[PDB]
Design a protein around this ligand. Structure first.
Ligand SMILES: OC[C@H]1O[C@@](CO)(OC[C@H]2O[C@](O)(CO)[C@@H](O)[C@@H]2O)[C@@H](O)[C@@H]1O
Ligand SMILES: OC[C@H]1O[C@@](CO)(OC[C@H]2O[C@](O)(CO)[C@@H](O)[C@@H]2O)[C@@H](O)[C@@H]1O
Length: 480
């Protein structure tokens, strides 16, 4: 991967929300030496959100005692008692290796998050676990993970959300150590997802109003929805979360954008947040990928995106995504191709493996318009990005790789006004991925695609009528 974060070696999994220390963002992520094997927390720094510097393991796997997801905060006021500016983290671990005992362990660092010391006693015990007996109770006790910590400025205390089976739990605390149980957050459509890696934060919209957001990784495949990240805007009063609407909004419509996390940007912490996700899906994550045999590592994170909250008519709010601004500094060549009308198919005179392509498509009678990336000259391999019906689709089907096939999860789609007769597309292509930012970024589709060495072409296509392809610009992205 040219511009996507990958581990030096081993298995990459869930990223942990970054903390800001030493002028950079400190990213943590689950790492294991074996694919989908037991592991812990590794460390990587980044100052711009594009290039990362790996520092190795910081919260190691212990004998039959792995480290799962959680989060970390900079105890600036020294409320935890480990010192002013101490980086305090909570992480779920299966006590005694017992899954039904998975609970929250605290770790703290005095050097900005580079080395952590462990507090032996869990700060939030899995009481249900020890009482669980029925097959229903133990299943519940086996889903009490991923603590996301947030400082509630209004009440002056810490609030923490934990993912449970088809619901989320809340706890408050004045010192990150002693937690008081609050009311749960329930939602109607359980066919959505069971809440893993929940997110909790406050953000200011373009109209100046403050809002809370509760989100989480879901699995809504069964009902035709994504298996990525969904959020509910609302408010937290210190005892329970009030969603403005119980039907959540999605942040990505692609196949691979799981365990996503968000963090405040250094330059505008209240209005602009950064986000990054693990580009993988559990439907097939536990397996060997091309990079394993060629480089000994498995997994990459998505590009870092910027998030902002925009007011909508009717008084509701939605998030908007766009590639991290600094990516522009890694552009090594900018190629513009003349506008053109195509009726059927046409191959662009450009080839590459890591780049960003922007273009507009306007049509009338055409029922299908689109662009194909990673096109092999033998004409057999390619990934299709286009508009059909009410779908803005990304079909990685013709890019399936022998022995690493992603079937049947080939065609991802985001909703788009079927009445639209034009659309703007910003597409990021890298050696093992495709990320499509549609229009103004309200809808994004992220997916891993196993491109071959010769999958470097690009072609345009329409079905049922001509389409005008304009503003075509291709930006080659480099290592630095
Ligand atoms: O079975 C889960 C279901 O039960 C409710 C209450 O009706 O809460 C269960 C849950 O609340 C705790 O006390 C705290 O999170 C847990 O210990 C207990 O399992 C629902 O909210 C939930 O959907
Ligand atoms: O290569 C372009 C050509 O392929 C067709 C069908 O053979 O469409 C491909 C493309 O459209 C969808 O079916 C829309 O849902 C995608 O899933 C699929 O990738 C032609 O329409 C097009 O001209």
């Amino acid at each position: 991967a040219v511009y996507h974060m990958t581990p030096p070696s081993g298995w990459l999994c869930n990223p942990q929300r970054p903390v800001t220390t030493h002028g950079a963002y400190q990213l943590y992520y689950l790492h294991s030496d074996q694919n989908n094997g037991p592991g812990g927390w590794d460390h990587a720094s980044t100052t711009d959100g594009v290039a990362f510097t790996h520092h190795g393991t910081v919260m190691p796997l212990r004998p039959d005692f792995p480290v799962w997801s959680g989060s970390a905060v900079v105890d600036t006021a020294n409320t935890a008692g480990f010192g002013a500016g101490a980086v305090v983290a909570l992480a779920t671990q299966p006590t005694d290796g017992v899954r039904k005992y998975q609970e929250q362990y605290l770790y703290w660092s005095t050097d900005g998050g580079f080395t952590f010391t462990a507090l032996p006693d869990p700060v939030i015990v899995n009481t249900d676990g020890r009482a669980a007996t029925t097959p229903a109770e133990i299943e519940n006790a086996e889903w009490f993970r991923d603590p996301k910590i947030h400082w509630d400025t209004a009440r002056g205390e810490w609030v923490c959300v934990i993912g449970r089976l088809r619901y989320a739990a809340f706890y408050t605390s004045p010192n990150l150590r002693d937690w008081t149980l609050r009311r749960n957050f329930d939602y109607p459509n359980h066919a959505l997802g069971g809440i893993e890696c929940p997110d909790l934060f406050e953000i200011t919209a373009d109209d100046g109003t403050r809002h809370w957001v509760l989100a989480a990784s879901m699995d809504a495949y069964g009902i035709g929805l994504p298996m990525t990240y969904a959020y509910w805007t609302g408010t937290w009063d210190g005892e329970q979360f009030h969603a403005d609407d119980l039907t959540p909004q999605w942040l990505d419509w692609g196949w691979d954008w799981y365990a996503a996390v968000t963090w405040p940007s250094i330059d505008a912490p209240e209005t602009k947040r950064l986000a990054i996700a693990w580009m993988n899906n559990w439907k097939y994550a536990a397996r060997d990928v091309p990079t394993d045999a060629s480089d000994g590592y498995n997994g990459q994170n998505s590009i870092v995106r910027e998030l902002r909250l925009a007011r909508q008519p009717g008084g509701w709010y939605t998030l908007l995504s766009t590639p991290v601004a600094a990516l522009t500094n890694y552009v090594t060549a900018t190629t513009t191709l003349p506008d053109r009308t195509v009726d059927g198919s046409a191959v662009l005179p450009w080839n590459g493996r890591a780049y960003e392509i922007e273009l507009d498509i306007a049509w009338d009678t055409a029922t299908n318009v689109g662009i194909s990336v990673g096109r092999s000259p033998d004409g057999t391999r390619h990934t299709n990005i286009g508009k059909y019906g009410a779908d803005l689709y990304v079909d990685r089907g013709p890019s399936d790789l022998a022995g690493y096939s992603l079937a049947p999860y080939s065609r991802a789609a985001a909703p788009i006004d079927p009445g639209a007769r034009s659309v703007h597309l910003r597409i990021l292509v890298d050696t093992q991925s495709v990320e499509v930012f549609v229009n103004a970024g309200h809808t994004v589709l992220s997916q891993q695609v196993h491109f071959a060495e010769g999958d470097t072409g690009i072609s345009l296509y329409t079905d049922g009528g001509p389409a005008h392809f304009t503003g075509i610009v291709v930006r080659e992205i480099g290592q630095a």
